[PDB]
A paper describes a structure:
EDA is a tumor necrosis factor (TNF) family member, which functions together with its cognate receptor EDAR during ectodermal organ development. Mutations of EDA have long been known to cause X‐linked hypohidrotic dysplasia in humans characterized by primary defects in teeth, hair and sweat glands. EDA·A1 and EDA·A2 interact with two distinct receptors EDAR and XEDAR respectively via binding of their THDs to the cysteine-rich domains (CRDS) in their receptors. Here, we report the crystal structure of EDA C-terminal TNF homology domain bound to the N-terminal cysteine-rich domains of EDAR.
To reveal the structural basis for the interaction between EDA·A1THD and EDARCRDS, we crystallized the EDA·A1THD-EDARCRDS complex and determined its structure using the single-wavelength anomalous dispersion (SAD) method at a resolution of 2.8 Å. The crystal structure reveals that EDA·A1THD and EDARCRDS form a heterohexameric complex, displaying a triangular-shaped architecture with an EDA·A1THD trimer in the center and three EDARCRDS molecules at the vertexes of the complex. The structure of the THD trimer in the complex is almost identical to that of the crystal structure of the apo EDA·A1, indicating that binding to the receptor does not cause substantial structural changes of the ligand. Each EDARCRDS molecular binds across the convex surface of a single EDA·A1THD in the trimer, burying about 1340 Å2 of total solvent accessible surface area at the intermolecular interface. The 1:1 binding mode between EDA·A1 and EDAR is markedly different from those previously observed in other TNF-receptor complex structures, such as TNF-TNFR2 and RANKL-RANK, in which each receptor binds into the concaved groove formed by two adjacent ligand protomers of the receptor. At the EDA·A1THD-EDARCRDS interface, although all three CRDs of EDAR form direct contacts with EDA·A1THD, the second CRD mediates most of the interactions with the ligand. The driving force for the binding of EDA·A1THD to EDARCRDS is predominantly electrostatic interactions via three pairs of charged patches on the surfaces of the receptor and the ligand with complementary electrostatic potentials. A cluster of acidic and polar residues in EDA·A1THD (Gln256, Gln261, Asp265, Asp273) mediate a panel of electrostatic interactions with positively charged residues in EDARCRD2 (Lys78, Arg88, Arg89), tightly tethering antiparallel β3-β4 motif of EDARCRDS to the surface of EDA·A1THD. Instead, the presence of Val307 and Glu308 extend the length of strand βC of EDA·A1THD so that the aromatic sidechains of Tyr310, Try311 and Tyr343 pack together to form a hydrophobic patch that makes intimate contacts with helix α1 from EDARCDR2. Our crystal structure predicts that a glutamate substitution of Ala259 would severely deform the saddle-shaped depression of EDA·A1 whereas a glycine replacement of Asp265 reduces the acidic surface area at the interface.
Residue numbers in the entry:
A (entry chain B): 247 to 389
B (entry chain A): 247 to 390
C (entry chain C): 44 to 59, 66 to 118, 127 to 137
Amino acid sequence: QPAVVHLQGQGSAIQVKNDLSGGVLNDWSRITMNPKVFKLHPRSGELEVLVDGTYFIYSQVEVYYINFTDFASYEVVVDEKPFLQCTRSIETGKTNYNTCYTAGVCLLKARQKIAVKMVHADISINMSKHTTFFGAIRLGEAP
Amino acid sequence: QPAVVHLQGQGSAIQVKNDLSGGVLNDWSRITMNPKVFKLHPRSGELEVLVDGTYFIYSQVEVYYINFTDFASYEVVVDEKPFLQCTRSIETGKTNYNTCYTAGVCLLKARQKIAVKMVHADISINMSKHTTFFGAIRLGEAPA
Amino acid sequence: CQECPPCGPGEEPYLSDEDYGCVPCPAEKFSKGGYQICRRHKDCEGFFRATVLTPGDMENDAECGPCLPPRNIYGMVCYS
């Protein structure tokens, strides 16, 4: 049947400006990854596809601290090029627990790198396994 | 091919006479390192090379204060024997931030330890992650 | 089928003859594992608390104490 994948935050909270490489979340946990269709690159945090198809991609990030912005925002990048975007206005300078979810569907080609990228630098993200996750589902054949 | 290492200071401001044992800088935060060619001793501040080779070793120490000496200095030592030495005369009793860089090439045998040793003086070091660093490049093998 | 070479406390896996090994942990990070990657210290403002046990590199995560930096006093995540 269809192949799915559900990555999770492995535990501790991160600082985008220090713990990340270009705002890309890389601390993932392959809990229910199908090996026939998906391949995760741990150091980069890219979800690579192996089969050309139609993919429903979902993601959620828990942002709790921001400096110099008035709003937190992230992109679901398809080969370092934006597809979806989730933005949330958050009180700047103080702790604000907010999970930010975005999902969409698009046609993909094999060996395609999908990633979660924060547009701002001064963000504190809680990489919890229940508040931060990244997933994809091969629905079927590409029209 | 080539194996490298880059260590950064961990923020805090060291006073050498009160925070170090023999002037050796020990609080190095590793940001890049091949554990197959390099090994880091945290309590001693040594950087051990695990294989024979030709090494390019570099260091930078940010000195921000000096007391009754006006002569801030340090050495890149291998097995407690100096190799490089960076000197810097500064106005005493005044905060003067200034980074001190030195680098050089040398042949090393397996198990040799490299360290950054300050001279015994009332010097103040700002161990920032960008102003105070210590690294090396194993260029290749040490011939004969 | 042998076990992957375990890491010591305050050291995380270095994956890449294969140069797989174990590298130490950065300044504000720790590792109580054999295959656990290095993770950041517990947040004082993420929990709204203060630091009773200052964190370290190994088997040493930050342990919070009370939480009055405005005036938060509750058991796990405390608030005003």
